[PDB]
Amino acid sequence: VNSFSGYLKLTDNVYIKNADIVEEAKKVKPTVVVNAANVYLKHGGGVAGALNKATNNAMQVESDDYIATNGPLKVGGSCVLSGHNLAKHCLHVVGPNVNKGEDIQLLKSAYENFNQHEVLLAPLLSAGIFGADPIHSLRVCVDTVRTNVYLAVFDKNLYDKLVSSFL
Ligand SMILES: OC[C@H](CC1CCC1)Nc1ncnc2[nH]ccc12
Ligand SMILES: [Cl-]
Numbered sequence: 001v002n003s004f005s006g007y008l009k010l011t012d013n014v015y016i017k018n019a020d021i022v023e024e025a026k027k028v029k030p031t032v033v034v035n036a037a038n039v040y041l042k043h044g045g046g047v048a049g050a051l052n053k054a055t056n057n058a059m060q061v062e063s064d065d066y067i068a069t070n071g072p073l074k075v076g077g078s079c080v081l082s083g084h085n086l087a088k089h090c091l092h093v094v095g096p097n098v099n100k101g102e103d104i105q106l107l108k109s110a111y112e113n114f115n116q117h118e119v120l121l122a123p124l125l126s127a128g129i130f131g132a133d134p135i136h137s138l139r140v141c142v143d144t145v146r147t148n149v150y151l152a153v154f155d156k157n158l159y160d161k162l163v164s165s166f167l
Pocket of ligand 2: 047127
């Protein structure tokens with residue numbers, strides 16, 4: 001039993017809800033919130049900009065130190081950093097950004113990072129401003145993640161479309 005509420009169950013382990021991930025994380029304070037990161041951990045827009053804003057820029061400060069020490073992530077890769085006031089940990093995961101010409105096949109590799117954590121709150125990787133088809137992202141999620149994932153989707157028409165089209 002966990003404290004996630006109001007989710008539709010899609011499979012044994014994948015759940016979905018129309019929600020603002022910032023407001024969800026503040027309520028649940030999950031062990032792991034997933035950020036839709038880029039390789040530079042520059043949290044400007046989309047989910048990343050919203051999560052960072054909610055931390056009063058502390059996420060960006062921590063991220064800049066991480067990059068200065070370690071260099072950029074790989075597309076498809078991840079790192080674990082603090083969750084600040086939102087969660088215990090933030091798993092920064094880099095899905096391919098189609099608006100940059102990155103290979104969509106890397107989306108499966110990106111979702112594989114979720115399997116290192118028993119329970120996660122997360123957005124659909126490569127959706128929104130990353131320019132991929134969200135129906136595809138949900139399909140890859142369901143077919144790749146084996147741990148318990150609670151997907152937040154900050155758009156009603158999209159959410160309704162994702163539910164009604166889910167196979
Ligand atoms: O990338 C996945 C979705 C895509 C957008 C919804 C339609 C375009 N983004 C988000 N999902 C959940 N919570 C969020 N908070 C701020 C942004 C955000
Ligand atoms: Cl987005």
